Amino acid sequence: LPEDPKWEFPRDKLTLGKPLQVVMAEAVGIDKDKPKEAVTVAVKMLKDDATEKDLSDLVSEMEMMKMIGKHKNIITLLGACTQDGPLYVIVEYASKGNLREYLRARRPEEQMTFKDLVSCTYQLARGMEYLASQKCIHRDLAARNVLVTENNVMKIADFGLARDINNIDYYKKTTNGRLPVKWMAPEALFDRVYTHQSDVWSFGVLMWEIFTLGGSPYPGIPVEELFKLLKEGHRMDKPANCTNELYMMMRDCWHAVPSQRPTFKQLVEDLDRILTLTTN
Amino acid sequence: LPEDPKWEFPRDKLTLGKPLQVVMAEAVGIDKDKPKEAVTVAVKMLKDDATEKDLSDLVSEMEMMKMIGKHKNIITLLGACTQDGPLYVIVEYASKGNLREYLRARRPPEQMTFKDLVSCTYQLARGMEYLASQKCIHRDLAARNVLVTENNVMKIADFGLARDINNIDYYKKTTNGRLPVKWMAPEALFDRVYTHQSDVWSFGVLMWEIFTLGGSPYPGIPVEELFKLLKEGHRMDKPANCTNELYMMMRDCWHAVPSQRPTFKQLVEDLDRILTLTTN
Numbered sequence: 001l002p003e004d005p006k007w008e009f010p011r012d013k014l015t016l017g018k019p020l021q022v023v024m025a026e027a028v029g030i031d032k033d034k035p036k037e038a039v040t041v042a043v044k045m046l047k048d049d050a051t052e053k054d055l056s057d058l059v060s061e062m063e064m065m066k067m068i069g070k071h072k073n074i075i076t077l078l079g080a081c082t083q084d085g086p087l088y089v090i091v092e093y094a095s096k097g098n099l100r101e102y103l104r105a106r107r108p109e110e111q112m113t114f115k116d117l118v119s120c121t122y123q124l125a126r127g128m129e130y131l132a133s134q135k136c137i138h139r140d141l142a143a144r145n146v147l148v149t150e151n152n153v154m155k156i157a158d159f160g161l162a163r164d165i166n167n168i169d170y171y172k173k174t175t176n177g178r179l180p181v182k183w184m185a186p187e188a189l190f191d192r193v194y195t196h197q198s199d200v201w202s203f204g205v206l207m208w209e210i211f212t213l214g215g216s217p218y219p220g221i222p223v224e225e226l227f228k229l230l231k232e233g234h235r236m237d238k239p240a241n242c243t244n245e246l247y248m249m250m251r252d253c254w255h256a257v258p259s260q261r262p263t264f265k266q267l268v269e270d271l272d273r274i275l276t277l278t279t280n
Numbered sequence: 281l282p283e284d285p286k287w288e289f290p291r292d293k294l295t296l297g298k299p300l301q302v303v304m305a306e307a308v309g310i311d312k313d314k315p316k317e318a319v320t321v322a323v324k325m326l327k328d329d330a331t332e333k334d335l336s337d338l339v340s341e342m343e344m345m346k347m348i349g350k351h352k353n354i355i356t357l358l359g360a361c362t363q364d365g366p367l368y369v370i371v372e373y374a375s376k377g378n379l380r381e382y383l384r385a386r387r388p389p390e391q392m393t394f395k396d397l398v399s400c401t402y403q404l405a406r407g408m409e410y411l412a413s414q415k416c417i418h419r420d421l422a423a424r425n426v427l428v429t430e431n432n433v434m435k436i437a438d439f440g441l442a443r444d445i446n447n448i449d450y451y452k453k454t455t456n457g458r459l460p461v462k463w464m465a466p467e468a469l470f471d472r473v474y475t476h477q478s479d480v481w482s483f484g485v486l487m488w489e490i491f492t493l494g495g496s497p498y499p500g501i502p503v504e505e506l507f508k509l510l511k512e513g514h515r516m517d518k519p520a521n522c523t524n525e526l527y528m529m530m531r532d533c534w535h536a537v538p539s540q541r542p543t544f545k546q547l548v549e550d551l552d553r554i555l556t557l558t559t560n
């Protein structure tokens with residue numbers, strides 16, 4: 001595995017901790033301006049029974065994070081141990097766990113206000129807008145893949161399936177075979193393609209998970225019959241305690257025709273518009 | 281999915297239970313001779329966040345089990361619900377759980393005798409011998425994939441990666457990419473092939489797991505560093521309280537040259553001798 005001095009971190013300065021596969025850890029001087037300060041981080045590494053694909057996925061994940069760059073709503077890559085030893089991808093520790101658990105925790109913890117839910121959505125849109133601008137497709141957008149920091153900042157995570165928009169085996173039968181079906185854009189399966197508009201479809205599902213406070217999509221419908229239903233025009237109903245406007249946004253994301261779905265840019269504008277009104 | 285009468289089972293006769301993905305369940309009349317008799321079984325079905333590949337694997341697993349036929353040391357297929365609903369693959373319920381959990385729970389403070397261990401290995405060899413005569417390659421042999429019945433009968437399970445000997449794409453970079461590295465034969469990755477002798481290498485690691493009472497293979501050695509070490513002749517050490525003879529058997533399974541490894545038949549005959557001589 002190539003040596004990338006820019007991101008390399010000393011193994012001796014990293015102390016593995018409890019489980020969060022991902023484990024918590026203490027990294028000394030991970031923050032270069034504080035050479036002697038120990039920081040609590042999260043480390044992703046291979047499981048003892050890992051496969052070859054698990055290895056290339058982890059490497060790919062690391063590289064995608066390097067390419068993407070830093071952003072307020074994207075879990076931060078801090079460093080990596082790639083030489084003489086097991087691969088460790090060191091990222092920022094999110095003390096509140098993943099979004100899905102966070103939301104169910106405060107179901108009617110401190111309950112979520114309508115505005116909170118909107119802010120949450122807004123923050124995620126911003127991250128995907130930036131992500132999309134960096135020519136990256138996530139492919140695994142879901143509440144379970146969103147982390148929430150101590151200050152309740154939303155952070156898109158788990159880049160285990162992310163790709164560069166240009167690195168996709170267009171039309172091959174084996175493409176997009178590992179994406180959770182219920183968060184998947186129809187074209188991703190039927191035509192074996194994946195564009196930024198495919199990610200917005202998933203964003204739609206994510207919006208539904210958020211406003212239902214971590215609910216499970218297409219409740220009662222097995223993945224086996226989901227695609228026949230999606231093909232017939234079936235869409236999830238509006239979450240209670242959710243605005244008609246917001247649900248319309250969700251539906252927009254789920255337009256059968258990819259190019260008829262809004263862009264992340266347009267989504268951010270509309271959400272910001274709504275957020276400003278709700279907080280005024 | 282195509283209708284397959286001989287194997288179909290009525291959904292209204294099955295009552296799903298707790299988790300064991302797999303769950304326990306009661307199947308009324310699954311035993312044709314006992315039409316009103318309810319039987320405790322196991323059911324494998326897709327998770328709510330399953331991928332397309334998960335579905336093809338479940339289907340593949342089911343078909344492999346139909347083709348293999350019944351055998352004493354192989355988890356037996358009982359039936360399946362493949363129509364108008366989520367796919368359920370019904371298999372016999374093994375009350376003692378998987379072999380790995382089984383051995384660990386019986387470590388020195390119901391301990392395992394040396395004969396029990398040899399007996400376990402022998403049974404598994406017989407199962408693999410049969411499988412090979414059916415032109416089947418399991419590809420995922422390991423203690424976590426062996427189930428033990430109420431009468432301590434060993435049963436090879438989880439045919440989620442199994443293939444007909446001819447259904448392997450030799451030389452392709454994508455072949456064998458989903459096999460746990462620590463139980464995988466070098467030719468599997470290096471040459472991108474898979475034969476019964478590749479399963480023998482796996483059986484060897486399984487032997488080590490058994491004699492270490494559920495221990496983890498290559499302890500302290502990361503997966504990304506294993507193959508380099510194997511090429512250099514590294515091999516796990518003899519498990520404590522393991523005879524040099526059984527250890528030599530393990531070592532023979534780990535020969536770098538596939539044809540220098542014993543065949544499952546040779547393993548069965550040797551284990552039969554050792555087991556018999558221990559008994560007397």
Ligand SMILES: Nc1ncnc2c1ncn2[C@@H]1O[C@H](COP(=O)(O)OP(=O)(O)CP(=O)(O)O)[C@@H](O)[C@H]1O
Pocket residue numbers: 020021022042044075091092093094095097098144145147157158159160
């Ligand atoms: N930086 C971090 N801070 C806090 N918790 C984290 C974390 N990274 C991961 N986790 C926890 O671990 C869970 C799994 O993380 P992640 O989604 O990256 O897993 P993974 O890629 O290893 C497996 P899978 O693809 O099946 O989810 C998260 O949902 C969260 O609970």
Ligand SMILES: Nc1ncnc2c1ncn2[C@@H]1O[C@H](COP(=O)(O)OP(=O)(O)CP(=O)(O)O)[C@@H](O)[C@H]1O
Pocket residue numbers: 300301302322324355371372373374375377378424425427437438440
């Ligand atoms: N017939 C059965 N009776 C009892 N327990 C069973 C069982 N089938 C499965 N289990 C339990 O469930 C565990 C996982 O089963 P299995 O190996 O089939 O997993 P899986 O294919 O769903 C996922 P993976 O490939 O990650 O293991 C077993 O190790 C065992 O503890």
Ligand SMILES: [Mg+2]
Pocket residue numbers: 144145158
């Ligand atoms: Mg995840």
Ligand SMILES: [Mg+2]
Pocket residue numbers: 158159160161
């Ligand atoms: Mg992942």
Ligand SMILES: [Mg+2]
Pocket residue numbers: 424425438
């Ligand atoms: Mg298994």
Ligand SMILES: [Mg+2]
Pocket residue numbers: 438439440441
């Ligand atoms: Mg499996």
